[PDB]
Structure formats: structure tokens, C-alpha cells
Design a protein around this ligand. Sequence first.
Ligand SMILES: Nc1ncnc2c1ncn2[C@@H]1O[C@H](COP(=O)(O)OP(=O)(O)OP(=O)(O)O)[C@@H](O)[C@H]1O
Ligand SMILES: [Mg+2]
Lengths: 389, 31, 647
Amino acid sequence: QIKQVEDDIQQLLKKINELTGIKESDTGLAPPALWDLAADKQTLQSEQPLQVARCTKIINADSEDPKYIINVKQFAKFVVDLSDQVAPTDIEEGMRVGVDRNKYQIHIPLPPKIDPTVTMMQVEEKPDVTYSDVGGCKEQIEKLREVVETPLLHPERFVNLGIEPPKGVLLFGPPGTGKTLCARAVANRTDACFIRVIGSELVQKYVGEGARMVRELFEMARTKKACLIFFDEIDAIGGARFDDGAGGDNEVQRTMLELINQLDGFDPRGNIKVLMATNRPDTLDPALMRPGRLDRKIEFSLPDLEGRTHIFKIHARSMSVERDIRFELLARLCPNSTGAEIRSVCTEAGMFAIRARRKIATEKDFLEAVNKVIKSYAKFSATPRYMTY
Amino acid sequence: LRQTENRATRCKVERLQLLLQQKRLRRKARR
Amino acid sequence: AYAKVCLYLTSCVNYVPEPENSALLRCALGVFRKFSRFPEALRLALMLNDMELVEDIFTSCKDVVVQKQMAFMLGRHGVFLELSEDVEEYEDLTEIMSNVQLNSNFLALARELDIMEPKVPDDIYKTHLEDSARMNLASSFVNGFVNAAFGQDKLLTDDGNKWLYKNKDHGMLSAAASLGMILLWDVDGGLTQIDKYLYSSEDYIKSGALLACGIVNSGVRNECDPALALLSDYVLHNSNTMRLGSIFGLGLAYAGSNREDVLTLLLPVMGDSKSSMEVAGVTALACGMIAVGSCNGDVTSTILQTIMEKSETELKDTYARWLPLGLGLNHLGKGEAIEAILAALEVVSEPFRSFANTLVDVCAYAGSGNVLKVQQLLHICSEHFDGAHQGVAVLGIALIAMGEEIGAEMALRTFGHLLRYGEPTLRRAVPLALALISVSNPRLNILDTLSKFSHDADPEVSYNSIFAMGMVGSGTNNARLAAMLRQLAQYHAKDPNNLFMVRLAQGLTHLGKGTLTLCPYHSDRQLMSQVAVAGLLTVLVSFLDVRNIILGKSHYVLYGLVAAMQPRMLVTFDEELRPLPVSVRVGQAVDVVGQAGKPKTITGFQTHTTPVLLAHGERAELATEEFLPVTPILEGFVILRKNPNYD
Ligand SMILES: Nc1ncnc2c1ncn2[C@@H]1O[C@H](COP(=O)(O)OP(=O)(O)OP(=O)(O)O)[C@@H](O)[C@H]1O
Ligand SMILES: [Mg+2]
């Protein structure tokens, strides 16, 4: 009777759909559970649409009946007045006025414009990485934790001593040392607005578009009460300014200068704390590296023996390794290696076991993995160059 | 009324906590 | 052979009609006893509710260590066996059954995973990134929930009269019982603090401290009887003004004990009729909590006489819902037997019928999974009166369907459709039932639906949805849910009547900083805890009417929620009850179900040293074959022996 049961189950599903709502996703429609037609009719008959304009000037701002010069974007500019439901103080000379049609007056104050590209940068889903997934950089974790979390968690211990906590960090180190890993850990552990930015995301085709979105990013952060920004791969736009003779890097230098002025200029930067992740901290501009903008430069040097042993432990926690581990032997056997190298060694040990069709990875498998990842791949390593860099 | 109840509770809860202390002392002595 | 049999019998028991479940359980128990798997036999006996068989198996067990681990399991489930004075280590087994040393073990896990630093309500609120008596009540509630079972805090353990006086009216009771729940689980040395508070000139404060004593003794079992004394001394003669704190504290303190002395002390205060309807309801509730599952003729009879005696308008008035609730708690999970009570209630009164009948029926068929019963409930749901029976009926579908991992999700779908096609009362109730069907079990459809309907226009549906989402997150402090609750606080910043619920959800989510679980079931997803389900059903039936009970003056039911507070624990012990920190791996569930493949293989390996704070649905197995576990399933406290075969 099994097939009869499945046939009945699917027929029942088909009937439930046919009588409740089946398929409406072509025109992005919703399931009919949350369909408040009674409310939406009153919405369309009682809430008139409002065209978004900008209040340019307030003629006769005194208590006398004022007049506001609005500029309905790309439509027209008008002299208008406020709705009797809107208080005069709720509207300034730069807010998005939000005026109705038909004697453009039914006002709703409206926040600053944010580019969709910039606003699609807040970290909504927090990374699944924690501070316990980072090993061999205890002091770096402590310093980064201080700077980014501790003021945002217990500000009393800072205002008691009257200290301004450092607001700005530069995580710098060779390719694969825990820079982006620690950024993800900070994003996961932080209760605040985390905004990730990628140096390549500030390269835009039209002059003044990189600086424009830097300004928008920082002013959105300012609108939010407690914000951590994280410029990863900051090498992209952050580079020492050189005159040249053909105007090279003028646009990227302009957006970098906008970032500089936003970090520390003729303005209180706000409650924004910034991270700069890089593996070439020798191109960054001296102004960018000034401790008024990057206060707490942190070096993610290649882990020492203890750090490598800890990283091996971390990456082999969930593996099916055998009794005797000798991860200390592995750490001494693969010096001047990165956490990326170590995780690859663990993965290759697991794959050697899988290829042999075993369910237990042994010390011989780990030694083969070290030979494959550290010795054979030694010619593709980035450390010999990026340690100089 | 209220004072009588309070004194009753005082003396009797002292007795109760004393009994609990004896119980814990017996447990520790066993341990 | 063994695996085939046992697994098929367990699954079929969960997935089979009523008449065959008992016989399948009998043969499963027989196979376990034949193959000499005593802990499995005990688990089957408990899930059968066969105290006689439980005693028989436990006494037949002649191994001291296995008997002690059985005692741990039975204490976690909640039962106080009256063992005779001739067994393997009588005193140790009896105290393990009584569940003492739980305070020390909980503190030890806290120290191993340092969480002893107090968290004030403002710390969880995080207002620095985003009133009056209502806010004081909410702050006290969340403080208590977060610092439950630690005996530590920063509001009340420090200067506490300031907090008490900042709280107003019933906020006094709220704060006092919040302190009680902070000192919960064997801080009976805290009788000192709660006594030097109840030595007070304020009636609310004194009664709240009495409730604090009761709740501290809740779950605890001490042969000194540290509750009956206080509770009787206060509740003997003053049965006119409030009495709710005292009665509720007694009930919460003793619960599954089912001690005739406390039964016969609670019955007369209910039957006197000189105590307000609130006291009568709370007394029936306390009787039910004390006797969660007995078929107790005395309790049943007194409830019937109370329902008959109370006037028609009194029954109309709320807080009468707790009398049939007490009767159901008495007839908890007993199944068909209730026919006599059902007929009696049917002949009692016409309009109160639907309510009392449905409540007792659902509370008796809890976990049965009777599809025909749920069909009767759904027909009652379809028939719209043009409501209280409607809400208790939706709660009934939840309560009866929280037994199968498939029926549970399908009942979630049914609840979604119920909200879609429902009426005011139906929609108001659905969130409570949808919380019951999943407690301390974050699920990314339950959370989404509750979050969506928190914003709903209906304020009471919003209340229930927010409390339900907090319930789902209970004891599982989660970044996503905490951020969601903070966002909801921002949303309902001005609305105090809803921001109180939002704050309550925040605290209940961060329960114990994250150590506990309000889920009624335990062990390995099929072991109903009668005390825990009684507490949860109490809280949710009270919430069925949220404005006049919780938002009014009856949050002692929120404090009764404590009846279901049990820890998510994996502490390991030596043969002589000593800590054994041992590497243990964790994961959720994986296997190949061929024939009867056991779902015991875990893939999310995460090596830990016990104590380990495992989450909902994660099975933790040993890291190495150096110790053998006496219990086949590693939940709660365990005793691990040294494998004589080889390290
Ligand atoms: N210290 C470490 N501890 C644990 N894992 C590490 C560590 N360093 C690197 N890893 C592993 O390497 C990856 C993290 O590298 P990450 O992305 O942070 O590098 P990066 O330093 O930002 O380098 P890049 O210059 O390539 O951007 C993850 O797989 C992580 O498991
Ligand atoms: Mg990177």
C-alpha cells in the first residue's frame, strides 16, 4: 500500500494548494496567508504616495509662516509649506523632505540617501567563526578584542579613567595568518553594526564615485550608534600618493584621501571603529598609517612552534585522528608555515586516509600530508615574498 | 499577629537550617 | 538482532496507535531485560509509567555504579523512590535520587565555562546601542531568568531593598521570587537570605520571599522537608487576603513528590471557599503540580466539588481555568481513563463545558499522538463560537502532537494554516501552542513565523508571538534571536504593554546566561517529564488570557515556569561520585537507516572535556575507548568506568 499512500499524500498536497494558493512567485507575490486585503484597500485609499524631494532653503525661517524650497529630484523645484501634522523642527535644510503631489506639502521627513551598493555592506548574517577558532596569535586577539569589543561592551571602565580608547586597527601580515579570520571572529562576536568593505569595491568607473561612496559609508555609520567598519584588502585603494607624470592613481588616491578625511579631519569621526586588513602594509599611505587613523597596528606574523601546535589542534579537533598525534612533531616539522598551510596539511591527511579507504587518519598520513603541502608545494608559497612585503 | 508569625518563622527556620547543616556535615564526614 | 528489535520497537511505539504501544513496550522491556541492558529497561519502564516495574528493575540491579546512574537518570526525570533500607549504598542512591549536589555540579560547570560574572538586565538589554513599574518588573524578571540557579547577581544580592522599593505593587512579589529563582537548585543556604527578607513589614515582600523559598526548593528534594514547614506556618490561618505566593511556592517546591501531607494541606485551603477565586485556582494548580499524573481520586473529587460549588458567574470569570487545569495535571498522560471525569464535566455546566472538557482531555492525552483525538480538536476548532475552548484546543493539538518528530513539524504547518484561516481567539492562542510544540529548540520557521506575527496588528497576538519566540529560544542564547528581540524592543519602544513581553523574551532566551532548557522531554527525544510539561502547560494556559493574567497581577505562573527548568548537562563522575574530566565528542545526528540503523553516529565532532554544555538535539559520545559508559545514552550526569579490556 506504500505507493497508494504516496499517491494520496501528493494528491492531498495538490488539493491543499489548489484551495489555499499554489504558485505566484513569477511576479514576486507572497503566499496568501499574510494577505490583509481589508487593510490594503484602506492603505491605498488613505495613504497617498509621496514623492521624495530635498528641502533646499527655508525662506523666512522665523516664527512667521515660513516657506521651504523643495527640489523634487529630476522633476522640478517648488516653494511649499508644511503639513499641519508635521512640526517645523522635524525638518532641516538638508533632510529628504518627502512631499506629496497636489500642492506639494504633506511632509514626511526622510533619511539621507544611501547608495544601494553601500547599504548592501552591513553584515546581516554573522560569520560562523569564533575567537576560539583562531590559534597562535593570543596577543593579537587580545589587542583587537580590546579595541573593537571592550569599549562597545563596558564603556564605564573607560569613562571612569577618562580614556579615549584607540579607534582604528590595521591587521597586517602574509597571505594567510588569521587577518580575515579575526575579522570574521570580530563580526561574529560583536553586538553592533558591522560593515564589511572590500578595497576592490571602492573602485568605480566615474571620477568622484569612490569618494562619494566612502562619504556615504561613513555617514551611514554615523547615523548608526555603534559601528565597526572593516576594510579588507585595503591595499586596493590605500597606496602612497605618487606624482608620476600622467596622473596615475589620481582617482584611487582621491577616494583614499576622502577616507583619510573621514577617519580624522575637521569633524568628530563619531563612534566608528575601523579595521584595515592587509598583506602588503608597505604601500599604504603614511597619512593612512598615522595613529590618528590606524591606532593599533597589529602584526599577524607566522605562528611560532606553540602557535602551530595550537593551530594543528584546532584544525584536527573534529577529525578522526588516531591515538598518538604528535602535533608538536608536525609543528616543528613545518616551520615558517601559515594557518592555511596547516589546515591544508590536516585536510590532505584526511584525504590520504579517504583515498586509502580508511576511517582513521594516522601519523603516517599526516607526515605524507606535510610532505605534500609544505615540501612539494613549497614553490607556490607566498610567505617568501610577503614576509619582505 | 504579624510579630507572632515572624517569631515563629525565625525560631523554626533556624531549626530547619540547623538540620540542613547537620545533613551537610554528615555528607562531608562520609566524603 | 538486538539493534533491529529495540530500534524498531521504539520507533513503532512512537508511531503506533494506543492499544499496541503498551504491548510493544512490554516486549521491548522484556528483550532489554533478557539481554541485560538495565538502563534501557529503566528508560522503557519510565516512559511506560510503571513505577512498580521501575522499582523491580532498580532493585534487581545489583551493581552499585549502575544503580547510582539509574538514580541520576530517575532524579533528572523527577521521581523520589522510597527505597527500603537494604540496597547497594542506600544513602548515596537516595541522595542521588533526591538530586542533591546539583548546586555544586552546576557551579562546577559554570567555573569550567566561566559564567559566574553576573549579568545585569541592562547588560542584556544593551540600551546604549538602541516605563516605571512595568520596566522594573521586566528587569527583575530577566535578571532572575539570566541568573537562575547561580545564587549570584548584582541587583538583589547587592543592595536589594532599593530594587524592591523601585518595584511597585506586585513588583515586590516579582523581585522576591526572582531572587528565589536566582538561588534555585540547592542554594538552601539561601534560606538565610530569603528568611531575613521575609522578616518584613510588607505583605507583598514577605509572601514573595515565601514563594522564593518554595521555588528554591523546587526540583530539590531534602529529607529535612525545608518547604512544608515555612509554607504551612504561613498558610495555616491567613486564608483571606492573597495566599497565592504561599500556595504557589509550595506547589512549585514539591511538584512530582506527590506527598500526602502537602496534598492534604493544599486541599482544605481550596475547599474552604473563604479564599478568593484566585487562591482557589492557584490551589487547584498546586494540587495538579504536586500530583502530575496520578488518577488521584481525592484531587479529582475536590476539583469536581469546587467546580460545582463556584457560581455560574464565578466560572465565567477568569482564573477558573486553573481548576480544570489542575484536574488535567492530575490526570496527566493517563490516557483514556478520564471518561468519568469527561462525563462529569459535561454534566456540570453547559458553557464552561467546552473549556474544561477540552483542557482535561488534551492534558490527559498529552504526547499520545491520537490522530482521531486531534481530529476532534480540529473539528472543535472549525466550529467557531462567534473562544477560550478554541485556544485551549489549539494548545491541545500542540500538546498531543509534540511526541513525534514528523507529527510535530506537520502540526507546525497546521498551526500556520490555523493562523491563516483563524478567528481572533484562534490566532491569539496559536503562538502559545506553537511555542509548546517547540521549547528551547530554535527552528528557522518557528522563529520566522513568530517574528512576523509579533508585528501583527492584534496586540494580544503580538504578545503571544513574542513570548512564544522567547520560549523557543529559552536557554539557548542565540545571536540571531537576541538581535531579533533587540530589534523588537526598538520597534515597540513606546508600547510598554508589549515592551514588557519583549524584555521577558530576552531574559528567558538568555536563561542562566545559557545553561538550561525548558523543553519537557529529555534524554533522547522520547521521555516526557510530567513536572516540566505541567509547568509549561500552566504558563501557556495562563497566557491564553495574557492581559488580565500576566500583564495584570498573576505572573506567579511565569515563576511556576520553573517547574520545567532542567539543565543541558554532560558532567561525568567517578564510581565514588568524583569529577572525571574526559575528552568527549559532540554532534547532532547522523547514520544510515538500513533495516534499523541506529541514529547514534555524530558527524559534527567537537572534542570537549566534561563538563560539557551540549545544545538541543546533540548527542555527545566518548572521545576514546578508555572509559566505558554505564548509560548507553550520555545525557545529564554520567558515571564512567575504566575499560578493563584496554585503555
Ligand atoms: N592563526 C590561525 N588559526 C586558525 N586558522 C587559521 C589561522 N590562520 C589561518 N587559518 C586558516 O586559514 C584561513 C584563514 O585565512 P585568512 O582568510 O584569515 O587569511 P588572511 O591573513 O586574511 O590572508 P590573505 O592575505 O590571503 O587575505 C581559514 O581556513 C583558517 O582556518
Ligand atoms: Mg583576507
